[PDB]
Ligand binder design. Structure first.
Ligand code: ADP
Ligand code: ADP
Lengths: 118, 436, 305
């Protein structure tokens, strides 16, 4: 009755920026540091498409796992740690299932991974 | 659950409509109950409802008489409901329609009305138009009034009055003297294809306005002469309620050069104005024969004009061109070129079954003698085509007239419909016409 | 967007996060009443493109390179002494896609496209015919680079011994003259379609005329599949529809055939679900059409015709 109302669509509720401006640098710091990069094993690069508003973080090492990315997301940001979601590649739109699956097996090599809250 | 689809009739009887047993079960109807039909323009009709196994559950069979009384064409939907309230009426007032009784003078009651309702218990509603065959013609009568309004059953004690001059035909009352599918016999498979071909373009125009699909435009009719290709193209038009425009080969080829191409264009223009429309080129081969048939500088320019018109057509126009020829070879290859006459339907000589039906269609208005076995005539007119059987009947009739009438009545002023109603055609006359 | 047996064009009027944005599942979509106008430099995706031609790659490739320089780099030949092709002869049965190809090549290279139709030309009186011929070449040169397409060339210039009179042979003569006077600097390429070599008058092949030929025959199963997929792009096919199967029982059919074959299927679908399901009116419902799906049964029916 005074305008500006957001509709109540069937899409899953959203998680905004729970981390303060300062907190998010330390939140990437963990992720960037947090997991293993052994230079003597050939690399790969991932670009995450979070639903947070269109937030994208990249990086990684040689052969790891899809679940390790799911771990990076949580490490890179607290809020999502409780939120349920899934992973993907767009334009064939394959749902990254079998969380363990290694990057080699999923063709997830240097390829963009989208995040969708269930 | 009443709404059904209007399909053709099996029982050519005016008062009866048919359905599938199952359907009658759903509507709780019986082998004789009088039903009340509802169609377009707030119109209604009263008929008897029988059972038919060849009738599809969702459809209802009925003749053009009823179909017209309802302002419906084959394909529309009507609402059927039980009518257990119909009475055994008192007095009914009927009146013919001028154009149907022109030339015949005399008692139309004892000649038509009487035999028609006679022990029939035919139900009738005010405003309907029925047809009575006899005296070598079919008269149309409008039911101006039935004492028990608006509908009653004509029982043997019902009084029928024919008081006064015949009435005019209302612009929206199509004559049953017009060509319709029930005038074509022996072309079941071909008539079926033609129908489904023109069905959507002609019945559902607005469709091809929001759709990219491409409907048929030209449809080629193959068959020897007298096969009934003109009959079919016309009936289709009437039946679908599409405007029918005619183009006769020689009619065009008789024009001074230019005037011939001028008339082809005008033919399509007028047909496009009154869409949905069917242009029917009768005797195409006379206009468009090519690649060995001549390049006589005017003959070819005309074929080219005709190819141009076929290309110029566009679905927006809602027009279907039908053409007829004896065989493919006659026509010029380009006419079949995709985008022009891309559809073709073969209509050859009828078989024993076919010829029979044809014979039945061309005697429906005459009094055949019990000795007349149409099945016999059919079983010895093998090669013959529709046109032949038709002419055959006419000659039989004329013979019959020459025998019993021309002599024993060399006096004029006997245009009376009673005389014609009593004159019968014997199997002996059909035996004569054969030997000709 | 394809569907409901058609394709609708939509212009992004405004995006929230300004210049560009990714349409996420939470993105609010507004499509408020009104259909906007098509501007001048905005072609219709309903125009013919190379993606509308299937079963021709080899031939489509030859033609592309042939016209590539003359139509895309006119200036080149202005400063060159090399001679580009002028006339290209496209032969093959009818409905093979020659007209389609020629029109597709014109748009796809932004060239002016002028159409001459054999019957049209031959329906006129003799002098008028020539007139039109030179008019086509005239208008073509004014808007060069251009492609003149003579459809049904054999209708105008039949073989040597198909000549029937001062008028028949007077037009072909006119067409030959026009071809010889057609200079390079003009930037015009005249394509012509016929059924086969023999059909045409040998003189149209003299070196400065229709010197280049390209055969566009009937499609093979692989080719036929391509076409079927193109003429069904705008519809909803049942999951039981096997186009490849269709293409296999289609030897001999040409593009126009398949195109029609599809229409039949789609009509057979409509006739079934439209007839009884009161889906008729003096206008159509986008949704009603969008729901309707052509089953493999419909294609088995179209074929049995
Ligand atoms: N299938 C048919 N059923 C009943 N009568 C027919 C049939 N075919 C032809 N006739 C009769 O013979 C005439 C031949 O008509 P028409 O259609 O003009 O022949 P066509 O075009 O094949 O040369 C018809 O007007 C009709 O009276
Ligand atoms: N190779 C093809 N690929 C896709 N569609 C085709 C092909 N060939 C023909 N068609 C379809 O059939 C129609 C035939 O067109 P057209 O080019 O005029 O034939 P042609 O010039 O060979 O006589 C086309 O408009 C198109 O819709």
């Amino acid at each position: 009755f005074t305008g500006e109302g957001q509709k109540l669509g069937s899409t899953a509720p959203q998680v905004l920026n729970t981390s303060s401006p300062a907190q998010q640098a330390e939140n990437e710091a963990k992720a960037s540091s947090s997991i293993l990069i052994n230079e003597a094993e050939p690399t790969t690069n991932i670009q995450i498409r979070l639903a947070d508003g269109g937030r994208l973080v990249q990086k990684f090492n040689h052969s790891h796992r899809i679940s390790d990315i799911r771990l990076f997301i949580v490490d890179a940001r607290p809020a999502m740690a409780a939120t349920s979601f899934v992973l993907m590649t767009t334009f064939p739109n394959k749902e990254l299932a079998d969380e363990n699956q290694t990057l080699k097996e999923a063709n997830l090599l240097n390829a963009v991974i989208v995040q969708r809250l269930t | 659950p009443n709404r059904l689809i209007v399909d053709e009739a099996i029982n050519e009887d005016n008062s009866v409509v048919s359905l599938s047993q199952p359907k009658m079960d759903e509507l709780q109807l019986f082998r004789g109950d009088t039903v009340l039909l509802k169609g377009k323009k707030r119109r209604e009709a009263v008929c008897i409802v029988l059972s038919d196994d060849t009738c599809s559950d969702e459809k209802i069979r009925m003749n053009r008489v009823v179909r017209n009384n309802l302002r419906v064409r084959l394909g529309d939907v009507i609402s059927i409901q039980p009518c257990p309230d119909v009475k055994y009426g008192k007095r009914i007032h009927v009146l013919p329609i001028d154009d149907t009784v022109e030339g015949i003078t005399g008692n139309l009651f004892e000649v038509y009305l009487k035999p028609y309702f006679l022990e029939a218990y035919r139900p009738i509603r005010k405003g309907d138009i029925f047809l009575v065959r006899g005296g070598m013609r079919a008269v149309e009568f409008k039911v101006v009034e039935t004492d028990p309004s608006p509908y009653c059953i004509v029982a043997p004690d019902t009084v029928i009055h024919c008081e006064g001059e015949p009435i005019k035909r209302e612009d929206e009352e199509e004559s049953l003297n017009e060509v319709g599918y029930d005038d074509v016999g022996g072309c079941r498979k071909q008539l079926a294809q033609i129908k489904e071909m023109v069905e959507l373009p002609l019945r559902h125009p607005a469709l091809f306005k929001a759709i990219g699909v491409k409907p048929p435009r030209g449809i080629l009719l193959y068959g020897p002469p007298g096969t009934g290709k003109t009959l079919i193209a016309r009936a289709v038009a009437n039946e679908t309620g599409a405007f029918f425009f005619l183009i006769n080969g020689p009619e065009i080829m008789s024009k001074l050069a230019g005037e011939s191409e001028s008339n082809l264009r005008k033919a399509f223009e007028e047909a496009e104005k009154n869409a949905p429309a069917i242009i029917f080129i009768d005797e195409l081969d006379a206009i468009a024969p090519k690649r060995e048939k001549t390049h006589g500088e005017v003959e070819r320019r005309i074929v080219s004009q005709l190819l141009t018109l076929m290309d110029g057509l566009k679905q927006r126009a809602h027009v279907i061109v039908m053409a007829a020829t004896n065989r493919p070879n006659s026509i010029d290859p380009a006419l079949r070129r995709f985008g022009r006459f891309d559809r073709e339907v073969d209509i050859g000589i009828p078989d024993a079954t076919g010829r029979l039906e044809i014979l039945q269609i061309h005697t429906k208005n005459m009094k055949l003698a019990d000795d007349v076995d149409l099945e016999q005539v059919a079983n010895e007119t093998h090669g013959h085509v529709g046109a032949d059987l038709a002419a055959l009947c006419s000659e039989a009739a004329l013979q019959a007239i020459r025998k019993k009438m021309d002599l024993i009545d060399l006096e004029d002023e006997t245009i009376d419909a009673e005389v014609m109603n009593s004159l019968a055609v014997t199997m002996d006359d059909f035996r004569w016409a054969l030997s000709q």
